[PDB]
Symmetry: C3
Subunit: 177 residues, 3 copies
């Protein structure tokens, strides 16, 4: 095809990339405890990870991108919950998955408010798998929502910053503005 | 990946990509029902998804190796879901299905892609034993995985034709790769 | 400030990549057997895959990231295959992976490597007559993380040496 190559000034994001990568490892291990029926420890890890992510932390993605990421976070939570509690709680887990199906239907219609509401419903239903650990399950869902938003903002800025530089260069070259 | 991004201004290529991603979410949720032993609902979703995906593709070439790499991943997804949903009761049947997947990977490594495709169909067929009243549902899930792998490889092939941005890796002050 | 591009066909690099991709498929199917409680067959495939990988200096941080991912795949397979009866052992193993991540975050890679080995060793307890097989699974995941880190380290020296050789040929032997 045809290639146009720009030389731009680097924006370094490595320490931020590693920080989100580490938060993702932490959330994964909280979910590994949930896969073993250990909601107390899963919740404690999630609370500390959320705390650390907020303490150490322009252009926002489109709402559709936010919901794509949050759907993935809900999927991770449901999959962990299903391994950890499917021996006993398939009734409640089926309800939670049904709600996630409604979230995808809303997402497909571009009704992102209904998508977000259905996803919150899905996570609330999981409280029924460990009713003495509902705060922990709620913290796991908050962490997944927080990591989804954080990754989407980093993925947005990763390409927005160079596209803005290119756009501004072409604007100067073509219109002398 | 993380070094490439595709401009999606054509809107019809936007809508085609979102349609494939959304059919993937649908198939994932059908597999989530299978992980809970709900083969009837898993199959109902798989058939609705296949029907809609085919209809919306109407009126709209990757190597055999590329097709099979994607189909192997679809088989992997189905096996993993069935193992969570039915491993407590049907490890005997699930073991047979995985053995057939192993044979498919051997055929794939030998570049015998016809044998690979056949061995994957045998793996999926053997899965019927975990839920003998829901054998049509289980075949519907496998067809959806194959259909999604075929569609994604096609969309991934029509990728070079679309405008795109790429970042080069800097090897030195004056030397880059892409 | 003129720009020149050398176009090179790296058939050997692609073949190396596919060899690692296929070994990933083999390792995954070993883990699939573990998810079904079939530790004997899992370890057999692991041993056979490690042998084939052997017949056919990494950066520390990259190898450690790969090892942590390998440990995650092993803990996830083991939780599915044995979580119904061996949760006490598996919980201890996950605790060690958490220690490994903390050490990794501090770039204390000796402590991270020790914790990961401890995590995998604790997994042995889920199938006490098959701990050789479970150890074999973990060795394969570490060998794969070493092979990917080695591949990444030599990713540019390979085509650079090929280019250097082609330029030398054209400049001095034509």
């Amino acid at each position: 095809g045809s290639m146009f190559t720009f030389l731009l000034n680097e924006e370094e994001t490595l320490a931020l990339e590693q920080r989100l990568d580490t938060a993702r490892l932490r959330a994964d291990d909280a979910l590994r405890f949930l896969r073993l029926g250990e909601a107390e420890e899963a919740g404690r890890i999630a609370k500390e990870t959320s705390t650390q992510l907020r303490a150490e932390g322009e252009v926002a993605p489109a709402a559709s991108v936010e919901m794509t990421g949050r759907l993935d976070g809900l999927g991770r939570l449901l999959d962990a919950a299903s391994v950890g509690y499917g021996a006993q709680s398939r009734g409640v887990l089926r309800q939670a998955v049904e709600k996630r199906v409604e979230a995808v239907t809303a997402y497909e219609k571009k009704d992102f408010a209904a998508a977000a509401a259905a996803m919150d419903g899905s996570a609330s239903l999981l409280a029924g798998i460990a009713p003495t650990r509902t705060e922990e399950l709620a913290g796991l869902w908050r962490l997944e929502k927080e990591l989804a938003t954080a990754h989407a903002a980093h993925e947005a800025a990763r390409w927005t910053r160079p596209m803005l530089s290119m756009h501004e260069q072409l604007s100067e070259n073509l219109y002398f503005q």
